[PDB]
Write a protein that binds this DNA or RNA. Sequence first.
RNA 1: AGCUUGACUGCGAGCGUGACGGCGCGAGCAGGUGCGAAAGCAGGUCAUAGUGAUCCGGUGGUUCUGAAUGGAAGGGCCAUC
RNA 2: UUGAGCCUUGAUGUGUAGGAUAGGUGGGAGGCUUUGAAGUGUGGACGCCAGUCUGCAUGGAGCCGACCUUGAAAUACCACC
RNA 3: CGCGGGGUGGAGCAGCCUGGUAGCUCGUCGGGCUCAUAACCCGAAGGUCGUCGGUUCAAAUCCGGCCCCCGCAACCA
Lengths: 117, 50, 223
Amino acid sequence: RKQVSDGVAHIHASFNNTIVTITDRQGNALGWATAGGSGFRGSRKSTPFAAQVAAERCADAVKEYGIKNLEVMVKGPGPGRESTIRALNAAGFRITNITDVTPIPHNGCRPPKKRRV
Amino acid sequence: GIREKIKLVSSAGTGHFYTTTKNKRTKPEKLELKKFDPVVRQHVIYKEAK
Amino acid sequence: AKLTKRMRVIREKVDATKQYDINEAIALLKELATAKFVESVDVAVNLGIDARKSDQNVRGATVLPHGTGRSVRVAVFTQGANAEAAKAAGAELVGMEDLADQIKKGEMNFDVVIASPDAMRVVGQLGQVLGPRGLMPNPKVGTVTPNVAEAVKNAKAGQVRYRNDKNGIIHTTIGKVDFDADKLKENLEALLVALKKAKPTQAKGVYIKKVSISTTMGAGVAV
RNA sequence: AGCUUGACUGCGAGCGUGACGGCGCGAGCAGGUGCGAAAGCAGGUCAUAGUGAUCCGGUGGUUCUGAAUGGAAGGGCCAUC
RNA sequence: UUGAGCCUUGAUGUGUAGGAUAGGUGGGAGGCUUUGAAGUGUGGACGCCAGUCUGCAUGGAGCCGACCUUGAAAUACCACC
RNA sequence: CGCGGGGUGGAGCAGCCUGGUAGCUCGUCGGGCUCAUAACCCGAAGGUCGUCGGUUCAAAUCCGGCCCCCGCAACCA
């Protein structure tokens, strides 16, 4: 395989997990990782280090595709949404832009917090 | 049965093979005994038993 | 660089997709070699034989009117005065118990080995190094025989061994471009009919489509 | 225990019984072997159940046959499941 | 357009082990190259991190082997696939 | 009376348009470590590549026998 050296990173963060996908700007996927699939369960995948292992694990999927300079698309409220990026920089990657692309539903479905007690 | 019929080759290279009933697939012991031949009628070594 | 000097001195002597005959091809092969030394002629040809079928494996020997195109060193293993008689008949050296040292180490300065059945024990226990080198005496081709003083005379009859490898390629040295054209013709015509006699009783498509000859200088030519 | 494979081979004077198909008993010769010092002996086990004719198809050999004639297919015969 | 296929083009081999990167493979002490290559290092490309290529550090016609020696097979000079 | 995919520590399965690395892993056996059992984490024990051949120093990677498995009266005349 020949190096492609360009792409876009799709990052999603929840209260207990951090998800990363790498794509070419055609919309086509080339690698994935999560703070859980990084070999962690329970709240061990909520750690600021599991968000680093997810970045280095997605970088292990594109190491032969040669991608190191990219732009980021961010989803979701989770605190890992910056802990994975401050670590991605320390892992040797160049970040050009970061855009928050989280949607805003006009209600529809009731918020999953419930309780109702 | 499971013992089954088997034919032997000869050291003379005969087209005629000698028949016996003997196991090969679960209890092989082989056979070499010499017997009468149909080509010069003075016996040949039947051997190996596959 | 990198097309070597002795190949640049022979520009515009070959054209692609061209047909020949032996008398036309050997006159060109003599014209591609410009070297000061005496150079050899080597055949390398592809046969229509399938690698999955055991009855299509091609290997043995033959006697040709000029052999491989050179004299050969013949060694003979036997006992008593008949070793000197065989040396006179057509052999360069007697096969000794001391000669097994050069055999087992693979540093042999000979081309053909003949044995008497009472001396065969000196080389039969070395078939692991004689066999793959094309030097092994075998009772099924008369190179292990009590009449060594006729077998060494046949070892001077122009003996050529043949063996195919993967994809059905086969290789033989057949002459020199310093030879007369009728001499180089008769030895090539004899190799081709010895190889047509060697055709298996089942072959894939056309068994032998062309015959190719080279010296490696300016590359080879087909007939 | 040692040797040995006669669990051979071509033929057979004749005899006993069953409605038939079928089944039992056997002198002696011919070819080639083995045991034994030799005399002498062996044509599978100590003997009574371990089992189908035929049709058909497969399979080694064979001018025995073979539809104009010469090969060939198919059949016959010797082998054989 | 695409599973399978074909004519046409361009470069190939460390899966281990080294002293060492032996594609398979047939011959082989005399031969290629000769204003350019040799080699181990920071820099540049790549990397199996061993080195392959490049300017420099640098040199200026070699390079190479037989004895010895790893290996089933060898390490110039070069076919066949 | 006949065919080709599979056969790789006790089971399951990669290894295979380079011919040698014995591998992924489940179980089995034993330790770190939390309140504690398992997860986790550190490790150990055991391979006739079905079984013999061809070409060979060499065949899991290609082939050919012999065997077993396979949707199935392989044909039973």
